[PDB]
Every structure is written in structure tokens, then in C-alpha cells.
Amino acid sequence: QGVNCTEVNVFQTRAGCLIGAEYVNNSYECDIPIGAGICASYQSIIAYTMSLGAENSVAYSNNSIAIP
Amino acid sequence: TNFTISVTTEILPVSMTKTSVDCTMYICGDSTECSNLLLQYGSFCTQLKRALTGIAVEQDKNTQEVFAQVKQIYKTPPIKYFGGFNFSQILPDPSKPSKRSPIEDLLFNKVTNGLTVLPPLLTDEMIAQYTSALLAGTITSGWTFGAGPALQIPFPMQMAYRFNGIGVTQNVLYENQKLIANQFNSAIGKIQDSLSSTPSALGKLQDVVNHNAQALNTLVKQLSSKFGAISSVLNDILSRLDPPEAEVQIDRLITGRLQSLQTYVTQQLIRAAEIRASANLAATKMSECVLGQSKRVDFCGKGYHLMSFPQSAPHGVVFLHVTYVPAQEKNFTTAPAICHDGKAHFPREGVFVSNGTHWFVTQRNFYEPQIITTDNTFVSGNCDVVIGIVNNTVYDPLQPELDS
Amino acid sequence: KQLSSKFGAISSVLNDILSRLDPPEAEVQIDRLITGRLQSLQTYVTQQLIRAAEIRASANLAATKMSECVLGQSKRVDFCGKGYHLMSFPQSAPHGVVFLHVTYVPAQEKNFTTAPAICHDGKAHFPREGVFVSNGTHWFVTQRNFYEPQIITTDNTFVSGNCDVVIGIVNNTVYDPLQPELDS
Ligand SMILES: *[C@@H]1O[C@H](CO)[C@@H](O[C@@H]2O[C@H](CO)[C@@H](O[C@@H]3O[C@H](CO)[C@@H](O)[C@H](O)[C@@H]3O)[C@H](O)[C@H]2NC(C)=O)[C@H](O)[C@H]1NC(C)=O
Ligand SMILES: *[C@@H]1O[C@H](CO)[C@@H](O[C@@H]2O[C@H](CO)[C@@H](O[C@@H]3O[C@H](CO)[C@@H](O)[C@H](O)[C@@H]3O)[C@H](O)[C@H]2NC(C)=O)[C@H](O)[C@H]1NC(C)=O
Ligand SMILES: *[C@@H]1O[C@H](CO)[C@@H](O[C@@H]2O[C@H](CO)[C@@H](O)[C@H](O)[C@H]2NC(C)=O)[C@H](O)[C@H]1NC(C)=O
Ligand SMILES: *[C@@H]1O[C@H](CO)[C@@H](O[C@@H]2O[C@H](CO)[C@@H](O)[C@H](O)[C@H]2NC(C)=O)[C@H](O)[C@H]1NC(C)=O
Ligand SMILES: *[C@@H]1O[C@H](CO)[C@@H](O[C@@H]2O[C@H](CO)[C@@H](O)[C@H](O)[C@H]2NC(C)=O)[C@H](O)[C@H]1NC(C)=O
Ligand SMILES: *[C@@H]1O[C@H](CO)[C@@H](O[C@@H]2O[C@H](CO)[C@@H](O)[C@H](O)[C@H]2NC(C)=O)[C@H](O)[C@H]1NC(C)=O
Ligand SMILES: *[C@@H]1O[C@H](CO)[C@@H](O[C@@H]2O[C@H](CO)[C@@H](O)[C@H](O)[C@H]2NC(C)=O)[C@H](O)[C@H]1NC(C)=O
Ligand SMILES: *[C@@H]1O[C@H](CO)[C@@H](O)[C@H](O)[C@H]1NC(C)=O
Ligand SMILES: *[C@@H]1O[C@H](CO)[C@@H](O)[C@H](O)[C@H]1NC(C)=O
Ligand SMILES: *[C@@H]1O[C@H](CO)[C@@H](O)[C@H](O)[C@H]1NC(C)=O
Ligand SMILES: *[C@@H]1O[C@H](CO)[C@@H](O)[C@H](O)[C@H]1NC(C)=O
């Protein structure tokens, strides 16, 4: 937490560094909060950025009504 | 007769800075005397760390709950046309890599060792994404998107829906639609000027930040005091005095620092309860005035509340309450009922109004003359028990059209 | 647990420490112990007061929900469960309450086209409670939820001014009741 990890697999985060897990570029649902948009889960242990659900933009126009 | 639309700002803080305090290293820097004497007080500093971790987890839960109230994020269409409603300084600008609207950019620019300052779980990027998604959901899905799957409704008809829900007939919206759009743009410009002008409008966030910084500064200042002992230095007494002879001095020092840490933690704890209550109130405000329109008055801004814009802010949330401000009053004469052909008549939803002798009907908060007909009235009782009733005829529909 | 700690004194015992120590220093030991135990009790009751205040605030919110969700229907959005609230069924719980929330979640969305108003015979048309909706060359009216097409008549619509300034307005014929019953 907080301290720079030049002094003390190794992954550099905003809140310090993480030892024991590998960082991936994909997105997963957050289970273990870490801080500054980092979340970890075990499937081996990995770390990933915060995923805010799924991106979904509904169609918008000058005349389009939706009634269930 | 004529109405204007203004916008106000409400700032409610959300989450203070999380602080983590270790006991042993705060009491003394790497000394074995504290290791062999702090446990003689029992597990005292353990519950302090337990309480501070509890504050950290409830602050994280609070800042998660105050914003993440949607299951899916919403993205604006690339076409910026909204039927005359220009949203440029409200919609986030993709030119800046941080994806911020200029209003919260100006608000961010205006608002400014054994301790540990933990970073928040949500940084400003995901808060900006939350505000952008909520703004998109409240502009393109109307007021019905939190009850289930996403819908789409164009802007003018859901303006008409909100005007119907506020207590006026929806026909008056299209009469001055461009006037309402121009007044909205002028109000957005004026509130941007007010945000850029007033320096004390954001006093709550600066107040809580200054309170936390001042508490930490007084903690640090009172740490370096002697507390009635010989030396104020943490480790100079280890070599200057015999460790048999330093027991009373180190006991007084550790109990004084323990009392100071206890009163600091209680003050912080109380404040933490206050900021949790304030952020819960802000969460109720967002859940009432953003997720759909509300009918209760004087809750979100001054006047009749239509809808609000939530925007990002450091350690808080700022709202843009869009209100209905009536004006252009005019004196008129009224009557509770009208008696026609020996039978009493009552208004369906409005009131009988007459400038001179000609009587007309109109809605509650807007003035427009209408012909008194049968379809907007009913017969119940006679014109004998009522008071203040006037005498006038009622024009009967379907009377002069069925004769031929 | 905090009772068993000596708090920097000789021992945690009370009666036995008086026998082995003289009263001039036993009063010092008892003074240290009494101050430390008073501090521990003060910490415990500070936690008790703050927990009582937080629980009282949460229970006042729970009582507001008790008088708002259970007593009748509350129109306010997502204050009693997720989505629109209709009714709630509370059950007895130890040191708490539990809430059910009968809600209304529509689904199976279908695309449709609309119009702000209808211009016909030099006058504007506006629905009294419904909304204009269409699928193709035929137009209908419906409510906010659970789409139900109906023929446009004069009882669910009204007239307000002329059709010149309303943007996006489109022609549509109107079926006026009592028109074919004129010569009977
Ligand atoms: C109170 O307001 C009402 C509503 O405007 C006024 O009634 C209006 O009175 C004028 C003049 O008497 C009417 O104008 C006339 O219209 C007929 C229509 O064919 C036209 O042929 C005449 O040459 C004349 O222009 C107007 O129609 C009438 N409006 C309504 C809705 O009945 C009334 O005069 C006002 N009273 C006072 C004291 O200001
Ligand atoms: C949009 O929805 C409306 C409402 O359902 C559709 O109108 C209805 O369409 C059906 C099927 O074409 C019509 O049924 C037909 O009726 C004739 C007698 O007129 C009969 O001989 C046929 O065998 C068939 O049953 C129905 O009459 C019609 N309703 C009205 C009032 O005309 C419309 O077709 C839909 N449009 C599109 C583009 O989907
Ligand atoms: C209504 O029509 C629009 C067309 O613009 C639909 O929007 C697209 O629908 C397709 C098929 O479902 C998707 O693959 C696209 O991603 C949608 N685009 C956008 C921008 O949303 C819309 O889904 C239709 N709605 C309904 C209820 O059928
Ligand atoms: C209601 O108030 C608005 C606001 O002043 C009026 O709009 C003005 O209309 C005049 C005449 O067209 C323009 O010269 C002004 O520039 C408009 N004001 C603004 C701010 O754009 C409107 O006319 C008023 N309506 C009534 C019925 O009095
Ligand atoms: C919406 O309002 C904004 C705010 O005025 C408009 O932004 C202006 O754009 C012009 C042309 O690019 C610039 O000269 C101004 O300096 C901008 N004003 C600013 C930055 O405050 C924007 O053009 C408007 N959009 C529409 C569609 O009318
Ligand atoms: C409205 O008209 C009715 C009948 O045209 C009035 O009733 C009469 O009022 C006069 C004096 O006010 C009495 O002498 C009659 O006996 C009344 N007749 C009946 C059948 O009641 C009534 O007073 C008028 N009201 C107003 C406010 O002018
Ligand atoms: C239906 O819409 C059409 C055009 O969208 C209107 O037709 C025009 O009406 C104007 C004046 O009403 C005439 O001068 C034009 O010659 C018409 N053009 C055509 C191609 O017919 C029509 O008026 C609308 N119907 C109603 C009842 O308003
Ligand atoms: C850690 O130190 C290195 C120096 O090699 C520096 O480049 C880096 O920015 C530092 N990181 C933090 C978080 O201070
Ligand atoms: C993937 O993650 C690595 C982690 O070091 C990063 O350097 C790289 O830029 C990422 N790639 C993309 C496309 O984001
Ligand atoms: C809505 O109308 C404007 C004004 O002409 C137009 O520029 C825009 O493309 C339209 N949007 C549609 C048809 O989706
Ligand atoms: C209405 O009449 C009262 C009584 O004289 C007066 O004080 C008030 O100014 C009038 N209002 C208007 C709009 O004429």
C-alpha cells in the first residue's frame, strides 16, 4: 500500500504494487476490492481493471417511441 | 400567463478521505519497549484498527451505493441534435482524454510521517463514466429506465409527459418550445457563470477537506509534545536514560498518545457518521429526482421540480435542478360553481375565470381561455346550497350539429 | 477481555495484590488500574452511543418505510424495492425487519413510431390521457405501458389551437363517434 516498489509477477498499480498475480487486459466482474479501479478474482489469481457492466447504447432518433 | 425556467445548484458531500492508522509505529518508531509494553494494556489498539477498517469499508460501500444504481451504462448517440435543446457543456467532451464536461472541469480547478492515506476505491474516471451514463439514460430513455430494460423516448414528448405530471396540460409546451429551449440555454450559461464567479459556493467540500487536514495537522503537532515527560523525542530516551528508569516516563508518554489517538478517532468516527448520513440523503435525492420525476415540492431546488442533472465532483455530488417558475400575474374574478337551467355545474379539473362578464375555464398554473362545454363539467345537486354562484349559460356540444 | 490485562501494573488481580504490596504503592497501582478501566469503559460506552445513534437513524428510515410502503401505495420511484412499488409484505425478524416488494417490471419491448400531435381540418389534436402510436399506415392510441391499440375518437382526445407551429406534426384522419347515427 502506497510505498513505491522499486525497493522490497511484479505489477505496478496506483496504490503500490501487487505480488502473486498477473495483470490481464480483459474485463471481469469485481469481487475483491483493491482500490483505484483494480479488482482481483481467482479462477490462479489474477488482477484486472474495473468493468462497469456492459456497454449498451439504445437507438435514438427524432421519432422513435418504445412501449412495452 | 408567462413562465420562465431557471436552474440552481445543490452540493452534498459524499465520501471523506480514507485514513488508516497503525498503533505501534505511531506510538514509537521501531522500538522494542513499545513491543513489550503495549501488550500490557491488552488488545487496545486492535479495536482502533478494526474501527478504521470499518470506516474504510463503509465509505467504499457508501461511494459505491450513491452512484452505481444502474445495471447497464448508457452511451449518447453521435448526433448531438435534441430538438433545439443544446447540451454541450453538460454532455462530456471527447476532446479531453479524461472525458469531462467543462462544468466539473471548472469545479475541479476551483476545489483543491507514520500516517497512511488510502486512495478511494472509485477514482474520478469511473465517477465521470457514471455521470455520463446517468445523463445519457435520463436524456434518451425518458424517466423510465431504472424499473427494468432500457427504452427510448424523444425529448419533446417526455417534456410533455413531465409537464402533464407537474400539473398543466401538455398543449402549452409546443406553443413556446423554442422559447423554452432558449431559456434553458440562457439558464445553463448563467449557472456556468455563477459557478465560475462565486468562490464560496463549494464551501462544504472545502470545509470537510479542511476539517480532515486540520485534524491530521493537530494530531501531528500534538504527537511531538513532551506530555509532561523529560524529552519529546521518541527514541532519545532509550539511550539517555536507563531502561529500568524510563518505565514511568514511557508509560506516561504511551498513555497520553493513546488518549490523543482515542479522541482523534472518536472525532473522526462521529464525522464519519455525519458524512454517511449526508451521503445517504444525497443518495435518496438522486434516487428520487433523477430516476424519474417527483411530485413533492421544495425538495430538489426552489419551485416545481421537473428533472435534475447529476454531475461529478470530488468528495461529493452536484445537482442541476430544472424548475418551473411562474410569473406575469393578472387579477381576475372567480366563482366556485355555475348554475344553468336550474342545475348546478362543477369544473372537471379547472376553475371558472372571467375578466369582465364573459366566463371561461382554464387549468391550474397556466392561463388560456376555453369555451365552457358539457364534456368538461357534470351535474350534481342544485344551485341552492352553494354560495357565491354566478348566473351564466353553458354552451352545449352536439346540440347544434345533430339538428341537420 | 480488557479486565484481565494488568495495564502496566504489577498484576491484574485485586485482592491478592493488596497482600503482597504495601498500601502506599497499592494505592498507586489501584489508581492506574481504575483509570485504565475507566478509559476502557468510556471507549465501550462511546461505541454504544454511536451504534445506538446509527441504529436509531436506520430504524427511523425503516419506520418511514413502514408507514410509506406498507400503508397504501407510494408513487415515489424505487423507494420501496427496485422499480415501481405497489405493495409490501413485512415479516417479523429478530433485531430487525424484512421487506418484500411487489413491483412492476415490463418487458418484451417492441419498436413503434409516434407523433407529437395530429393536424386535421385546420386544428390540432392532442390525447387526453393516451399517446399517439403507429406501426405502419394505420395509427392508434395507447397508454404508457402494455401497448393496446385503439381507434382515435373524440373522447380520448381534444383540440387546442391550430396546426402551424407544432413541429413534427403529421396528417391523420379521425373517427368521430355519432357521425353515422344522424338520420335515425
Ligand atoms: C374578456 O376576454 C374575452 C376573450 O377574448 C373577450 O371576449 C371577446 O370579445 C370580442 C369583442 O366583443 C370578440 O370579438 C368579436 O368576435 C366576433 C367573432 O365572429 C367578430 O365577428 C366581432 O367582429 C368581434 O371581433 C371576441 O370574439 C370575444 N372572445 C371570445 C372568446 O368570446 C371579452 O371582451 C373580454 N372582456 C373584457 C372586459 O376585456
Ligand atoms: C398495424 O397494426 C394494425 C392493427 O392490428 C393492423 O391493422 C389490421 O391488420 C389486419 C391484418 O392485415 C387486418 O385484418 C384483416 O381484415 C380484413 C377485413 O378488413 C380481413 O379480410 C383479413 O382477412 C384480415 O383479417 C385488420 O383489419 C387491420 N385493422 C384495421 C382497423 O384495418 C395493420 O395491418 C398493421 N400494419 C402493419 C404495417 O403491420
Ligand atoms: C428499434 O430499432 C433500432 C434500429 O435503429 C434498434 O437498434 C439496433 O437494433 C439492432 C438489433 O436489435 C442491434 O443490433 C443494434 O445494436 C441496435 N442499435 C442501437 C444503436 O441500439 C433497436 O434495438 C430496436 N428496438 C427494439 C425494441 O426492437
Ligand atoms: C414570456 O417571456 C419571454 C422572455 O422575455 C418573452 O420572450 C421575448 O419575446 C420578445 C418578442 O419576441 C423577444 O424580443 C425577446 O427577446 C424574448 N425574450 C427572450 C429572453 O428571448 C415572451 O414574449 C413572453 N411571452 C408573453 C406571452 O408575454
Ligand atoms: C451549444 O452551446 C455552446 C456554448 O455556447 C456552443 O459552443 C460555442 O461554439 C462556438 C462555435 O464553435 C464557439 O465560438 C463558442 O466559443 C462556443 N461557446 C463556448 C465554448 O462557451 C455550441 O456551439 C452550441 N451548440 C449548438 C448546436 O448550438
Ligand atoms: C339566477 O337566475 C335565477 C332565475 O333566473 C334567480 O332566481 C330568482 O332570483 C330572484 C331574485 O334574485 C327571486 O325573486 C326568484 O324567486 C328566483 N327564482 C328561483 C326559481 O329561484 C337567481 O337569483 C339568479 N342568481 C344570481 C346570482 O343572479
Ligand atoms: C396533408 O399534408 C399535405 C402535405 O404534407 C398537405 O398538402 C398541402 O396543403 C397545402 C395547404 O393545406 C396546399 O397548398 C398544398 O398544395 C398541399 N400539397 C399537396 C401535395 O397536397 C395537406 O394540407 C395536409 N392535410 C391537411 C388536412 O392539412
Ligand atoms: C517509483 O520510483 C521510480 C524511480 O525509478 C519512478 O520512476 C516511479 O514513478 C515511482 N513510482 C511512484 C508510484 O512513486
Ligand atoms: C495490456 O496490458 C499491458 C500491461 O502492462 C499494457 O502495457 C498494454 O498497453 C495493454 N494493452 C492495451 C491494448 O491496452
Ligand atoms: C432530426 O432532425 C434534424 C433537423 O433536420 C436532422 O438534422 C437530424 O438528422 C434528424 N435526426 C434523425 C432523422 O434521426
Ligand atoms: C390586484 O388587486 C390588488 C388590490 O388592489 C392590488 O393590490 C394588486 O396590485 C392587483 N394586481 C394586479 C396584477 O393588478
Description:
The first copy, chain A, is an all-beta fold. Chain A has strands at residues 10-13, 16-19, 22-28, 32-33, 38-42, 45-50, 65-67. In chain A, the strands form 2 sheets. Chain A has a 4-stranded mixed β-sheet with strand order 3-6-5-4, with no helix packed on it. In chain A, strand 1 and strand 2 (16-19) form a beta hairpin. Chain A is elongated. Chains in contact: A-B, A-C, B-C. Chains B and C meet through helix 6 and helix 10 of B and helix 2 of C. Strand 7 of chain A pairs antiparallel with strand 5 of chain C, so a sheet runs across the interface. Bound molecules: a molecule of 3 linked components (NAG-NAG-BMA) (2 copies), a molecule of 2 linked components (NAG-NAG) (5 copies) and 2-acetamido-2-deoxy-beta-D-glucopyranose (4 copies). Residues 4, 6 of chain A line the site of one 2-acetamido-2-deoxy-beta-D-glucopyranose.
Could you give a quick summary of the protein structure above?
This is part of a larger assembly, with three copies of chain A. The first copy, chain A, is mainly beta and 68 residues long. Helices cover 0% and strands 46% of the residues of chain A.
Major sheet characteristics of chain A? 4 strands, mixed
N-to-C span of chain A: 50 Å
The topology string of helices and strands of chain A comes to EEEEEEE
Oligomer state of the chains in this structure:
part of a larger assembly
- Which cofactor or ligand species appear? a molecule of 3 linked components (NAG-NAG-BMA), a molecule of 2 linked components (NAG-NAG), 2-acetamido-2-deoxy-beta-D-glucopyranose
| Widest beta sheet: strand line-up of chain A | 3-6-5-4
Greatest interface? B-C, 42 and 45 residues
What does the radius of gyration of chain A come to? 18 Å
Helix percentage range of chain A: under 10%
Question: Can you tell me the overall shape of chain A?
Answer: elongated
Query: What percent of residues of chain A are in strands?
Result: over 45%
> What's the total helix number of chain A?
0
Glycosylation sites (chain C): 111, 135, 171
Coiled coil (chain C): 1-30
Protein name (chain C): Spike protein S2'
Organism (chain C): Severe acute respiratory syndrome coronavirus 2 (2019-nCoV)
